[PDB]
Amino acid sequence: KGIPVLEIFGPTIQGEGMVIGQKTMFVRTAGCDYSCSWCDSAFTWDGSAKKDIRWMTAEEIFAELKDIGGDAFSHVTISGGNPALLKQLDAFIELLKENNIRAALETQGTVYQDWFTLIDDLTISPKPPSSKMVTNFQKLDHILTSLQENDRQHAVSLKVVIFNDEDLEFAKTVHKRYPGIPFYLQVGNDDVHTTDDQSLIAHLLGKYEALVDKVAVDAELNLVRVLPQLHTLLWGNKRGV
């Protein structure tokens, strides 16, 4: 029943996706069924921080959020890792809704949980070929079908990270497969380890413009948002922000 927690920080801003810029708290869980080659939070699954895992109850996480956040937040983003691996997260999501706190979720869309229907901002991020991951579309279909059946279409978005042209073609395939779902494109980060912020920012902004220029002429990507990682532009690869 305990929840494996690695990070609890905030208040900060959501740097990605459907609710980008939103002031929110963060709860990063441990464990991933994926092993993406460019995972910017590899410590959640690579075993390098397994000893740092704190198994907490829903009340303990909420108390710690209220502690470091005070009354200066009404939004909480649950990430990882793949939080969808944890069924016991239901007690925490319910506790948030019972305290007038809106919840967001970051998942790659492999495992479905019934507490998905309680998420106000559900971001599903299928992984492109550059992540060396293989996408199970049957599992992705089941998740999106279940969400649409519970009228959660206003709370669900698709976000694909792009590193090259191959990823962009993969993103088009996903977008065409699910026409009604709000679609997002995200700039891929090359160096998730570098400490030189100035070079990183200039590099990512260059990648952003190159992506924008490419999508601009693609007629199959008209209903698409193109966004970077704002928190990376502000603090680089720093954790806890």
Ligand X SMILES: Nc1nc(=O)c2nc(C(=O)OC[C@H]3O[C@@H](n4cnc5c(N)ncnc54)[C@H](O)[C@@H]3O)cnc2[nH]1
Residue 81 counted as an annotated binding residue: yes
Residue nearer to its own copies on the CB measure, 111 or 226:
226
Site for its own copies in 141-200 (CB under 8 A): 184, 198
Instruction: Using the CB atoms, write b or e for 71-98: b if 16+ within 10 Å.
Output: eebbbbbbbbbbbbbbeebeebbebbee
The least CB distance from residue 199 to its own copies, in Å, is: 12
217 binds its own copies (CB under 8 A): yes
- Phi and psi, residue 165, nearest 5°: -70, -30
SS3 at position 201: helix
DSSP label at residue 127: P
81 binds ligand SF4 (CB under 6 A): yes
Out of 106, 120, 121, 167, point to the residue binding ligand X (CB under 6 A). Answer: 106
Tokens representing 142? 């089941």
Binding string, residues 31-50; x marks residues near ligand SF4 by CB under 6 A: -x-xxx--x-x--x------
DSSP label at residue 126: P
Residue 191 touches which member of ligand X, ligand SF4, ligand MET, none, C-beta under 5-8 Å by kind: none
Residue 82 touches which member of ligand X, its own copies, ligand SF4, none, C-beta under 5-8 Å by kind: ligand SF4
Tokens representing 207? 């990648």
Binding string, residues 183-202; x marks residues near ligand MET by CB under 6 A: --------------------
What gap in Å lies between CA 37 and CA 32, rounded to an integer? 13
15 binds ligand X (CB under 6 A): yes
What gap in Å lies between CA 59 and CA 96, rounded to an integer? 10
Site for ligand MET in 30-49 (CB under 6 A): 32, 39-41
Tell me the number of residues near ligand SF4 by CB under 6 A.
12
Q: How far is CA 12 from CA 110, 128, 208, in A?
A: 28, 28, 23
Query: 35 near 45, Cβ under 8 Å?
Result: yes
Residue 69 counted as an annotated binding residue: no
Out of 79, 113, 135, 186, point to the residue binding ligand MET (CB under 6 A). Answer: 79
Would you state the torsion angle of the CA atoms of residues 106, 109, 112, 116, taken in this order, to the nearest 10 degrees?
A: 40
Query: 154 near 120, Cβ under 8 Å?
Result: no
What gap in Å lies between CA 104 and CA 239, rounded to an integer? 19
Residue 208 touches which member of its own copies, ligand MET, ligand X, none, C-beta under 5-8 Å by kind: its own copies
Residue nearer to its own copies on the CB measure, 54 or 225:
225
Site for ligand SF4 in 118-147 (CB under 6 A): 127
Residue 41 counted as an annotated binding residue: yes
Binding residue ranges for S-adenosyl-L-methionine: 81, 125-127
